[PDB]
Amino acid sequence: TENFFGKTLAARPVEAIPGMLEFDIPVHGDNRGWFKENFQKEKMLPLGFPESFFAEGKLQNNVSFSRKNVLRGLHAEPWDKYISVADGGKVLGTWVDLREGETFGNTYQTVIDASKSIFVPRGVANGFQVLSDFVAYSYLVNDYWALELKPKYAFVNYADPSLDIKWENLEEAEVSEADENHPFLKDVKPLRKEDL
Amino acid sequence: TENFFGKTLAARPVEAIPGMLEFDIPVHGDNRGWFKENFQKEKMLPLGFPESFFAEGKLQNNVSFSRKNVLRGLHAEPWDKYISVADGGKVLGTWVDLREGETFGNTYQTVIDASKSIFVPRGVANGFQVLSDFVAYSYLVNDYWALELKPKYAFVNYADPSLDIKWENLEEAEVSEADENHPFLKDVKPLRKEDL
Ligand SMILES: Cc1cn([C@H]2C[C@H](O)[C@@H](COP(=O)(O)OP(=O)(O)O[C@H]3OC[C@@H](O)[C@H](O)[C@H]3O)O2)c(=O)[nH]c1=O
Ligand SMILES: Cc1cn([C@H]2C[C@H](O)[C@@H](COP(=O)(O)OP(=O)(O)O[C@H]3OC[C@@H](O)[C@H](O)[C@H]3O)O2)c(=O)[nH]c1=O
Ligand code: NI
């Protein structure tokens, strides 16, 4: 459903990217603000949130704070991600499947705010562009990043025009030096089962 | 020297309230805003984050978004909490130990922004007042909401003047009806070890 407040917790797969799940999150508001169970393990497993997420006992919660037009992305590190927005902001979420197979290069985009979350399987590149004045982007992962290991990780350039995606403002996107220099899709080695 | 960006991940005890920990979180700023590892299990266990948090394999992440002068709490819920701020806001965090023993009624207060987090053991009442225009307050807990546990909650009234705490604006606090009506510390039954 579309309403911000009072949704039933529910999940829907994304047809073009196997394993991806889009969730409606219940948010309850009053005069003071609002409250959500952003992630609730017991309730999300029966909806298809994969038990394999928890198999290694690894957990990290990352948070970024970004202004309008900031674009972060296409990142496909060897871990799963559960993505959401923790404040009143919104982003255009964007995904490109980098797994070896019939879905290599498939894409999806959707607007994320505090009432929506996304499960992104390892091997699918994650990104977003900030639509609101600012946003708090909070996500859970199940393996641990190291600066030194970044050469081992998979990335694709947000600006590669052969990708079937449309950013809100490509030309004035506010980006890192790293995201400027990631390889185009044709130079990305598709991720095999054994690389994940 | 300023104390928001580029801190080393570190933990400290709160002398007055055993089992509590205050963390300095590394927040990395750049042209886009900032990024933090809000929680990182592998890096946080060595600093004393209790393994008992994970013993039952339960996990829930809550978020509340609150407007200025909102004051929530003094609630000792039947589970541990790991608390932090996910956006550019700040709160005055406030704690009152409700455990049976020599620290019953002990208090602590400190300002929490995205560069700080707090581990609150079960039995210690949690609360905050919003100092910024808005704030995204994101926390992890290790059990799930259930009416079978409501007998294991304890509450103290935020405005009991005999509490060794001071709020920023008491007079202009925006408080729920329920929070207005919690018992004064005198009329709270200390939580025993069996209740956690
Ligand atoms: C704790 C909790 C609450 N809720 C619902 C109940 C209400 O409809 C809504 C708002 O909660 P309130 O009972 O008004 O409590 P609130 O003042 O928002 O306080 C909560 O956020 C701040 C936290 O410090 C506190 O423990 C927590 O109870 O959220 C949930 O759906 N799941 C939960 O786990
Ligand atoms: C990913 C990560 C980064 N960092 C540091 C390195 C930088 O100083 C800073 C920003 O790192 P970037 O790689 O520029 O992050 P960003 O472009 O925001 O992308 C991150 O969030 C979106 C996610 O898709 C992506 O995996 C993750 O790298 O944070 C950490 O300390 N720990 C981390 O896990
Ligand atoms: Ni041990």
CSV table of C-alpha atoms and ligand atoms in Angstrom, one decimal:
chain,number,residue,atom,x,y,z
A,1,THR,CA,0.0,0.0,0.0
A,2,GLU,CA,1.0,3.7,-0.4
A,3,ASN,CA,0.0,5.3,2.9
A,4,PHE,CA,2.9,6.3,5.2
A,5,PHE,CA,1.2,5.6,8.5
A,6,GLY,CA,-0.6,2.4,9.5
A,7,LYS,CA,0.5,-0.1,6.9
A,8,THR,CA,0.3,-3.8,7.5
A,9,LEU,CA,3.8,-5.4,7.6
A,10,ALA,CA,4.2,-7.1,4.2
A,11,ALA,CA,6.7,-8.2,1.6
A,12,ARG,CA,6.8,-8.4,-2.2
A,13,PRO,CA,9.5,-9.8,-4.4
A,14,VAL,CA,11.1,-7.7,-7.2
A,15,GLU,CA,10.5,-9.6,-10.4
A,16,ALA,CA,13.6,-8.5,-12.3
A,17,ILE,CA,16.1,-9.2,-9.4
A,18,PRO,CA,15.7,-12.6,-7.8
A,19,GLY,CA,16.0,-12.6,-4.0
A,20,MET,CA,15.2,-8.9,-3.6
A,21,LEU,CA,12.3,-8.1,-1.3
A,22,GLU,CA,10.4,-4.8,-0.8
A,23,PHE,CA,8.7,-4.3,2.5
A,24,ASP,CA,5.9,-2.1,3.7
A,25,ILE,CA,6.7,-1.0,7.2
A,26,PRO,CA,4.1,0.1,9.8
A,27,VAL,CA,4.7,3.5,11.1
A,28,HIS,CA,2.5,5.0,13.9
A,29,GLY,CA,2.3,8.7,14.3
A,30,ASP,CA,1.1,11.2,16.8
A,31,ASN,CA,1.7,14.9,17.9
A,32,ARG,CA,5.2,14.0,19.1
A,33,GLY,CA,6.4,12.4,15.9
A,34,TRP,CA,6.3,8.7,15.0
A,35,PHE,CA,7.6,5.2,15.8
A,36,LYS,CA,8.4,2.1,13.8
A,37,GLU,CA,9.7,-1.4,14.3
A,38,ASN,CA,12.2,-0.9,11.4
A,39,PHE,CA,13.3,-4.5,11.6
A,40,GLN,CA,11.7,-7.3,13.7
A,41,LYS,CA,13.3,-10.7,13.1
A,42,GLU,CA,10.5,-12.9,14.4
A,43,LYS,CA,7.9,-11.1,12.2
A,44,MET,CA,10.1,-10.8,9.0
A,45,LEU,CA,11.2,-14.4,8.7
A,46,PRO,CA,7.7,-15.8,7.8
A,47,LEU,CA,7.5,-13.0,5.1
A,48,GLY,CA,10.5,-14.4,3.3
A,49,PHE,CA,13.4,-12.5,4.9
A,50,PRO,CA,16.1,-15.2,4.5
A,51,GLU,CA,17.3,-17.2,7.5
A,52,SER,CA,20.7,-17.4,5.7
A,53,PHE,CA,21.2,-13.7,6.6
A,54,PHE,CA,21.9,-14.8,10.2
A,55,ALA,CA,23.9,-18.0,9.4
A,56,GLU,CA,27.3,-16.6,10.3
A,57,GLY,CA,26.2,-14.6,13.4
A,58,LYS,CA,27.6,-11.4,11.8
A,59,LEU,CA,25.9,-8.0,12.3
A,60,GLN,CA,26.6,-4.4,11.5
A,61,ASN,CA,24.3,-1.3,11.4
A,62,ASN,CA,25.6,1.5,9.2
A,63,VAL,CA,24.1,5.0,8.9
A,64,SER,CA,24.8,7.8,6.5
A,65,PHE,CA,23.4,11.3,6.5
A,66,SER,CA,23.2,13.0,3.1
A,67,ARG,CA,21.8,16.2,1.6
A,68,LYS,CA,19.6,16.6,-1.5
A,69,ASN,CA,21.1,15.4,-4.8
A,70,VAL,CA,23.8,13.3,-3.1
A,71,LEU,CA,24.2,10.1,-5.0
A,72,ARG,CA,25.9,7.1,-3.5
A,73,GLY,CA,26.4,4.0,-5.4
A,74,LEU,CA,26.4,1.2,-7.3
A,75,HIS,CA,28.0,-1.0,-4.6
A,76,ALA,CA,27.9,-4.9,-4.7
A,77,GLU,CA,30.2,-6.0,-1.8
A,78,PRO,CA,30.0,-9.7,-0.7
A,79,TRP,CA,27.3,-9.2,2.0
A,80,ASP,CA,23.5,-8.8,2.1
A,81,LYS,CA,21.9,-5.4,3.0
A,82,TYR,CA,18.6,-4.5,4.6
A,83,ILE,CA,18.0,-0.9,3.7
A,84,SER,CA,15.7,1.8,5.1
A,85,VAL,CA,15.3,5.5,6.0
A,86,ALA,CA,15.4,6.5,9.7
A,87,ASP,CA,14.1,10.1,9.4
A,88,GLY,CA,11.5,12.1,7.5
A,89,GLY,CA,13.6,12.0,4.2
A,90,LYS,CA,13.4,10.1,0.9
A,91,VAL,CA,15.7,8.7,-1.6
A,92,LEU,CA,15.4,7.2,-5.1
A,93,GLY,CA,16.7,3.7,-4.5
A,94,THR,CA,18.5,2.0,-7.5
A,95,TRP,CA,19.7,-1.6,-8.1
A,96,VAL,CA,21.7,-3.3,-10.8
A,97,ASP,CA,22.1,-7.1,-10.6
A,98,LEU,CA,25.8,-8.1,-11.1
A,99,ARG,CA,25.4,-11.8,-10.6
A,100,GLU,CA,26.5,-14.2,-13.4
A,101,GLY,CA,23.4,-15.5,-15.2
A,102,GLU,CA,20.2,-14.5,-17.1
A,103,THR,CA,19.6,-11.5,-14.7
A,104,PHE,CA,23.1,-9.9,-15.1
A,105,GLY,CA,22.4,-6.2,-15.7
A,106,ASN,CA,18.7,-6.3,-14.7
A,107,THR,CA,17.6,-3.2,-12.8
A,108,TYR,CA,15.0,-1.9,-10.4
A,109,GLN,CA,14.3,1.6,-8.9
A,110,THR,CA,11.8,2.8,-6.3
A,111,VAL,CA,11.4,5.7,-3.8
A,112,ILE,CA,12.2,4.8,-0.2
A,113,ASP,CA,11.1,6.6,2.8
A,114,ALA,CA,10.7,5.5,6.5
A,115,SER,CA,7.6,3.4,5.5
A,116,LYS,CA,9.5,1.2,3.0
A,117,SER,CA,12.6,-1.1,3.3
A,118,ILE,CA,14.5,-3.3,0.9
A,119,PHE,CA,16.4,-6.5,1.2
A,120,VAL,CA,19.3,-6.6,-1.2
A,121,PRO,CA,21.0,-9.9,-1.8
A,122,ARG,CA,24.8,-10.1,-2.0
A,123,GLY,CA,25.7,-9.6,-5.7
A,124,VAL,CA,23.2,-6.9,-6.5
A,125,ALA,CA,24.6,-3.4,-6.7
A,126,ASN,CA,23.0,-0.8,-4.3
A,127,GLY,CA,22.7,2.9,-4.7
A,128,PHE,CA,20.5,5.9,-4.0
A,129,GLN,CA,20.0,9.6,-4.8
A,130,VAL,CA,18.6,12.0,-2.1
A,131,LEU,CA,15.2,13.6,-3.0
A,132,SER,CA,14.5,15.3,0.3
A,133,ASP,CA,16.6,18.2,1.8
A,134,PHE,CA,18.4,15.5,3.8
A,135,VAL,CA,18.1,11.9,4.8
A,136,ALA,CA,19.2,9.4,7.3
A,137,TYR,CA,19.9,6.1,5.6
A,138,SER,CA,20.2,3.2,8.0
A,139,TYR,CA,20.9,-0.3,7.0
A,140,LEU,CA,21.9,-3.7,8.3
A,141,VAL,CA,24.6,-6.0,6.9
A,142,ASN,CA,26.0,-9.5,7.7
A,143,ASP,CA,29.7,-9.3,6.9
A,144,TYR,CA,32.4,-6.7,7.8
A,145,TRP,CA,33.9,-4.2,5.5
A,146,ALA,CA,37.6,-3.4,5.5
A,147,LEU,CA,39.2,-0.5,3.6
A,148,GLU,CA,42.0,-2.8,2.5
A,149,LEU,CA,39.6,-5.3,0.9
A,150,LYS,CA,37.8,-2.8,-1.4
A,151,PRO,CA,39.7,-4.1,-4.5
A,152,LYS,CA,38.1,-7.5,-3.8
A,153,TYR,CA,34.6,-6.0,-3.9
A,154,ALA,CA,32.3,-5.4,-6.9
A,155,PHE,CA,31.2,-1.9,-8.1
A,156,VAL,CA,29.6,-0.4,-11.1
A,157,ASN,CA,29.6,3.3,-12.2
A,158,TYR,CA,26.4,5.2,-11.4
A,159,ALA,CA,26.9,7.2,-14.6
A,160,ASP,CA,27.2,4.3,-17.1
A,161,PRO,CA,24.5,5.3,-19.6
A,162,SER,CA,24.0,1.7,-20.9
A,163,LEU,CA,22.4,0.9,-17.5
A,164,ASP,CA,18.6,0.9,-17.7
A,165,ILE,CA,18.2,3.4,-14.8
A,166,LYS,CA,17.3,7.1,-14.6
A,167,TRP,CA,18.7,9.2,-11.8
A,168,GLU,CA,16.7,12.3,-10.6
A,169,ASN,CA,19.7,14.6,-11.3
A,170,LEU,CA,22.7,12.9,-12.9
A,171,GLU,CA,24.5,16.0,-13.9
A,172,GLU,CA,24.5,17.8,-10.5
A,173,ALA,CA,24.8,14.5,-8.5
A,174,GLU,CA,27.0,15.1,-5.4
A,175,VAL,CA,29.3,12.1,-5.3
A,176,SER,CA,32.6,10.6,-3.9
A,177,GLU,CA,35.8,10.3,-5.9
A,178,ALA,CA,35.4,6.5,-5.6
A,179,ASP,CA,31.9,6.5,-7.1
A,180,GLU,CA,33.2,8.7,-10.0
A,181,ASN,CA,35.8,6.1,-10.9
A,182,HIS,CA,34.1,2.7,-10.5
A,183,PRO,CA,34.1,0.6,-13.7
A,184,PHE,CA,31.3,0.6,-16.3
A,185,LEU,CA,29.2,-2.6,-16.6
A,186,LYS,CA,31.2,-3.9,-19.6
A,187,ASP,CA,34.3,-4.0,-17.3
A,188,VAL,CA,32.6,-5.7,-14.4
A,189,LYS,CA,33.3,-9.4,-14.1
A,190,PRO,CA,29.9,-11.0,-13.4
A,191,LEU,CA,29.8,-12.5,-9.8
A,192,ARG,CA,29.8,-16.2,-9.7
A,193,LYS,CA,28.2,-18.4,-7.0
A,194,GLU,CA,31.7,-19.0,-5.6
A,195,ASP,CA,32.4,-15.3,-5.4
A,196,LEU,CA,29.4,-14.9,-3.0
B,1,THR,CA,39.3,20.3,20.2
B,2,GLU,CA,35.8,19.3,19.0
B,3,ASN,CA,34.3,15.9,19.6
B,4,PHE,CA,31.9,15.0,16.7
B,5,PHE,CA,34.0,13.8,13.8
B,6,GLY,CA,36.8,11.3,13.7
B,7,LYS,CA,36.7,9.9,17.2
B,8,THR,CA,38.2,6.5,17.9
B,9,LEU,CA,35.8,3.8,18.7
B,10,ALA,CA,35.9,3.5,22.4
B,11,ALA,CA,33.7,2.5,25.4
B,12,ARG,CA,33.5,3.8,29.0
B,13,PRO,CA,31.5,2.6,32.0
B,14,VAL,CA,28.9,4.7,33.8
B,15,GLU,CA,30.1,4.4,37.4
B,16,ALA,CA,26.7,5.2,38.9
B,17,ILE,CA,24.9,2.5,36.8
B,18,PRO,CA,26.6,-0.9,36.5
B,19,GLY,CA,26.3,-2.6,33.1
B,20,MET,CA,25.8,0.6,31.2
B,21,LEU,CA,28.4,1.6,28.5
B,22,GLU,CA,28.9,4.8,26.7
B,23,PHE,CA,30.5,4.6,23.2
B,24,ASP,CA,32.3,7.2,21.0
B,25,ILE,CA,31.4,6.4,17.4
B,26,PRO,CA,33.6,7.3,14.5
B,27,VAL,CA,31.7,9.6,12.2
B,28,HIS,CA,33.4,10.2,8.8
B,29,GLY,CA,32.5,13.5,7.1
B,30,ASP,CA,32.8,14.4,3.5
B,31,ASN,CA,31.1,16.5,0.7
B,32,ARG,CA,28.0,14.3,0.9
B,33,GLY,CA,27.3,14.5,4.6
B,34,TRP,CA,28.7,11.7,6.8
B,35,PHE,CA,28.9,8.0,7.4
B,36,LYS,CA,29.2,5.8,10.5
B,37,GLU,CA,29.3,2.2,11.6
B,38,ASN,CA,26.6,2.7,14.2
B,39,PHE,CA,26.9,-0.8,15.4
B,40,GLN,CA,29.7,-3.3,14.4
B,41,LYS,CA,29.6,-6.5,16.4
B,42,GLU,CA,33.1,-7.7,15.8
B,43,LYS,CA,34.6,-4.3,16.8
B,44,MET,CA,32.2,-3.8,19.7
B,45,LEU,CA,32.5,-7.1,21.6
B,46,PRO,CA,36.2,-6.4,22.5
B,47,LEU,CA,35.1,-3.1,24.0
B,48,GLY,CA,32.7,-4.9,26.4
B,49,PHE,CA,29.4,-5.0,24.5
B,50,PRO,CA,27.8,-8.0,26.2
B,51,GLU,CA,27.5,-11.3,24.3
B,52,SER,CA,24.3,-11.9,26.3
B,53,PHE,CA,22.7,-9.3,24.0
B,54,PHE,CA,22.9,-12.0,21.3
B,55,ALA,CA,22.3,-15.2,23.4
B,56,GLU,CA,18.7,-15.8,22.4
B,57,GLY,CA,19.2,-14.9,18.7
B,58,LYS,CA,16.6,-12.1,18.9
B,59,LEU,CA,16.8,-8.8,17.3
B,60,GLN,CA,14.6,-5.8,16.7
B,61,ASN,CA,15.6,-2.3,15.5
B,62,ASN,CA,13.2,0.6,16.5
B,63,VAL,CA,13.2,4.1,15.3
B,64,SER,CA,11.4,7.1,16.7
B,65,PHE,CA,11.3,10.5,15.0
B,66,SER,CA,10.6,13.3,17.4
B,67,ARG,CA,10.0,17.0,17.3
B,68,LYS,CA,11.6,19.6,19.6
B,69,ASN,CA,10.7,19.6,23.3
B,70,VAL,CA,9.3,16.1,23.1
B,71,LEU,CA,10.2,14.1,26.2
B,72,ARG,CA,9.8,10.4,26.3
B,73,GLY,CA,10.2,8.1,29.1
B,74,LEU,CA,11.6,6.9,32.1
B,75,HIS,CA,10.7,3.3,31.0
B,76,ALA,CA,12.6,0.2,32.1
B,77,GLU,CA,11.5,-2.2,29.4
B,78,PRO,CA,12.2,-6.0,29.8
B,79,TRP,CA,15.2,-6.1,27.4
B,80,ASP,CA,18.5,-4.5,26.7
B,81,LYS,CA,18.9,-1.5,24.5
B,82,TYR,CA,21.6,0.0,22.3
B,83,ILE,CA,20.7,3.6,21.6
B,84,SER,CA,22.0,6.2,19.2
B,85,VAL,CA,20.9,9.0,16.9
B,86,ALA,CA,20.7,8.4,13.1
B,87,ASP,CA,20.4,12.0,11.8
B,88,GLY,CA,21.9,15.4,12.6
B,89,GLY,CA,19.8,15.9,15.8
B,90,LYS,CA,20.5,15.6,19.5
B,91,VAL,CA,18.8,14.5,22.7
B,92,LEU,CA,19.5,14.8,26.4
B,93,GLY,CA,19.6,11.1,27.4
B,94,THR,CA,18.5,10.2,30.9
B,95,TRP,CA,18.7,7.0,32.9
B,96,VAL,CA,17.5,5.9,36.4
B,97,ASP,CA,18.5,2.5,37.7
B,98,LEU,CA,15.4,0.6,38.9
B,99,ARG,CA,17.2,-2.6,39.9
B,100,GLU,CA,17.0,-4.0,43.4
B,101,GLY,CA,20.3,-3.3,45.1
B,102,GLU,CA,22.7,-0.6,46.2
B,103,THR,CA,22.3,1.4,42.9
B,104,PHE,CA,18.5,1.7,43.0
B,105,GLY,CA,17.6,5.3,42.1
B,106,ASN,CA,21.1,6.1,40.7
B,107,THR,CA,21.1,8.4,37.7
B,108,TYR,CA,23.1,9.5,34.6
B,109,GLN,CA,22.5,12.0,31.9
B,110,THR,CA,24.4,13.0,28.8
B,111,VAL,CA,23.9,14.5,25.4
B,112,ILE,CA,23.6,12.0,22.5
B,113,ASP,CA,24.2,12.9,18.9
B,114,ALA,CA,25.2,10.6,16.1
B,115,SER,CA,28.8,10.4,17.4
B,116,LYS,CA,27.7,8.8,20.7
B,117,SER,CA,25.8,5.6,21.6
B,118,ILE,CA,24.7,4.0,24.9
B,119,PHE,CA,24.2,0.4,26.0
B,120,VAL,CA,21.3,0.2,28.6
B,121,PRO,CA,21.0,-3.0,30.6
B,122,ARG,CA,17.6,-4.4,31.4
B,123,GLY,CA,16.3,-2.9,34.7
B,124,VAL,CA,17.6,0.6,33.9
B,125,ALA,CA,14.9,3.1,32.9
B,126,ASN,CA,15.6,5.0,29.6
B,127,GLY,CA,14.4,8.4,28.5
B,128,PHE,CA,15.3,11.4,26.4
B,129,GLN,CA,14.3,15.0,25.6
B,130,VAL,CA,14.8,16.4,22.1
B,131,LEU,CA,17.1,19.4,21.9
B,132,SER,CA,17.3,19.9,18.1
B,133,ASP,CA,14.3,20.7,15.9
B,134,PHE,CA,13.8,17.0,15.2
B,135,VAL,CA,15.7,13.9,15.8
B,136,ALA,CA,15.9,10.3,14.6
B,137,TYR,CA,16.4,8.0,17.6
B,138,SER,CA,17.4,4.5,16.4
B,139,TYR,CA,18.0,1.6,18.8
B,140,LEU,CA,18.5,-2.1,18.9
B,141,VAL,CA,16.8,-4.4,21.4
B,142,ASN,CA,17.0,-8.1,22.1
B,143,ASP,CA,13.4,-9.2,22.7
B,144,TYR,CA,10.0,-8.7,21.2
B,145,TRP,CA,6.9,-6.7,22.4
B,146,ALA,CA,4.5,-9.0,24.3
B,147,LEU,CA,1.7,-8.6,26.7
B,148,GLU,CA,3.1,-11.5,28.7
B,149,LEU,CA,6.0,-9.3,29.6
B,150,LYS,CA,4.2,-6.1,30.7
B,151,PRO,CA,4.3,-7.3,34.3
B,152,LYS,CA,8.1,-7.0,34.0
B,153,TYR,CA,8.2,-3.4,33.1
B,154,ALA,CA,8.9,-0.6,35.5
B,155,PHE,CA,8.3,3.1,35.1
B,156,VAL,CA,9.3,6.3,36.9
B,157,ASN,CA,7.7,9.7,36.3
B,158,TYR,CA,10.0,12.1,34.4
B,159,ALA,CA,8.9,15.0,36.6
B,160,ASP,CA,9.4,13.4,40.1
B,161,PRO,CA,11.5,16.3,41.5
B,162,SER,CA,13.5,14.0,43.9
B,163,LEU,CA,15.2,12.3,41.0
B,164,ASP,CA,18.8,13.3,40.6
B,165,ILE,CA,18.2,14.6,37.1
B,166,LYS,CA,17.6,17.9,35.4
B,167,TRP,CA,15.7,18.3,32.1
B,168,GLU,CA,16.4,21.1,29.6
B,169,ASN,CA,13.0,22.7,29.6
B,170,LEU,CA,10.6,20.8,31.9
B,171,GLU,CA,7.9,23.6,31.5
B,172,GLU,CA,7.7,23.2,27.7
B,173,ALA,CA,8.1,19.3,27.5
B,174,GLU,CA,5.6,17.6,25.1
B,175,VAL,CA,4.8,14.4,27.0
B,176,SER,CA,2.3,11.7,26.4
B,177,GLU,CA,-0.6,11.1,28.9
B,178,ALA,CA,0.9,7.8,29.9
B,179,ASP,CA,4.3,9.4,30.8
B,180,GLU,CA,2.6,12.1,32.9
B,181,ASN,CA,1.1,9.4,35.1
B,182,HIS,CA,4.0,7.1,35.9
B,183,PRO,CA,4.6,6.5,39.6
B,184,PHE,CA,7.1,8.5,41.6
B,185,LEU,CA,10.3,6.7,42.5
B,186,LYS,CA,9.0,6.1,46.1
B,187,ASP,CA,6.1,4.0,44.7
B,188,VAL,CA,8.2,1.9,42.2
B,189,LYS,CA,8.9,-1.7,43.2
B,190,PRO,CA,12.6,-2.4,42.5
B,191,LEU,CA,13.2,-4.9,39.8
B,192,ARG,CA,14.7,-8.2,41.1
B,193,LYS,CA,17.4,-10.3,39.3
B,194,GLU,CA,14.7,-12.9,38.2
B,195,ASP,CA,12.9,-10.0,36.3
B,196,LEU,CA,16.4,-9.0,34.9
C,1,LIG,C1,8.0,-0.2,22.0
C,1,LIG,C2,7.1,-0.5,20.8
C,1,LIG,C3,6.0,0.4,20.5
C,1,LIG,N1,5.2,0.1,19.4
C,1,LIG,C4,4.1,1.0,19.1
C,1,LIG,C5,3.1,1.3,20.1
C,1,LIG,C6,2.6,2.6,19.8
C,1,LIG,O1,1.5,2.5,18.9
C,1,LIG,C7,3.7,3.3,19.0
C,1,LIG,C8,4.3,4.5,19.8
C,1,LIG,O2,4.8,3.9,21.1
C,1,LIG,P1,4.5,4.6,22.5
C,1,LIG,O3,3.8,3.5,23.3
C,1,LIG,O4,3.8,5.9,22.4
C,1,LIG,O5,5.9,4.8,23.1
C,1,LIG,P2,7.0,6.0,22.6
C,1,LIG,O6,6.8,7.2,23.5
C,1,LIG,O7,7.0,6.1,21.1
C,1,LIG,O8,8.4,5.3,23.2
C,1,LIG,C9,9.1,4.4,22.4
C,1,LIG,O9,10.2,5.1,21.8
C,1,LIG,C10,11.2,5.7,22.6
C,1,LIG,C11,11.8,4.6,23.5
C,1,LIG,O10,12.7,5.2,24.4
C,1,LIG,C12,10.8,3.8,24.3
C,1,LIG,O11,11.1,2.7,25.1
C,1,LIG,C13,9.7,3.3,23.3
C,1,LIG,O12,8.7,2.6,24.1
C,1,LIG,O13,4.7,2.3,18.7
C,1,LIG,C14,5.5,-1.0,18.6
C,1,LIG,O14,4.8,-1.2,17.6
C,1,LIG,N2,6.6,-1.8,18.9
C,1,LIG,C15,7.4,-1.6,19.9
C,1,LIG,O15,8.3,-2.4,20.1
C,2,LIG,C1,31.2,1.0,3.9
C,2,LIG,C2,32.0,1.5,5.1
C,2,LIG,C3,32.6,2.7,5.0
C,2,LIG,N1,33.3,3.2,6.0
C,2,LIG,C4,34.0,4.5,5.9
C,2,LIG,C5,34.9,4.8,4.7
C,2,LIG,C6,34.7,6.2,4.4
C,2,LIG,O1,35.4,7.1,5.2
C,2,LIG,C7,33.2,6.5,4.7
C,2,LIG,C8,32.3,6.5,3.5
C,2,LIG,O2,32.6,5.2,2.8
C,2,LIG,P1,32.0,5.1,1.3
C,2,LIG,O3,32.6,3.8,0.8
C,2,LIG,O4,32.2,6.4,0.6
C,2,LIG,O5,30.4,4.9,1.6
C,2,LIG,P2,29.1,5.2,0.7
C,2,LIG,O6,29.4,5.6,-0.7
C,2,LIG,O7,28.2,5.9,1.6
C,2,LIG,O8,28.5,3.7,0.6
C,2,LIG,C9,28.1,2.9,1.7
C,2,LIG,O9,26.7,3.0,1.9
C,2,LIG,C10,25.9,2.5,0.7
C,2,LIG,C11,26.2,1.0,0.6
C,2,LIG,O10,25.6,0.5,-0.7
C,2,LIG,C12,27.7,0.7,0.5
C,2,LIG,O11,27.9,-0.7,0.6
C,2,LIG,C13,28.5,1.5,1.5
C,2,LIG,O12,29.9,1.4,1.1
C,2,LIG,O13,32.9,5.4,5.7
C,2,LIG,C14,33.4,2.5,7.2
C,2,LIG,O14,34.0,3.0,8.2
C,2,LIG,N2,32.8,1.3,7.3
C,2,LIG,C15,32.0,0.8,6.4
C,2,LIG,O15,31.5,-0.3,6.5
C,3,NI,NI,34.0,-15.3,26.4
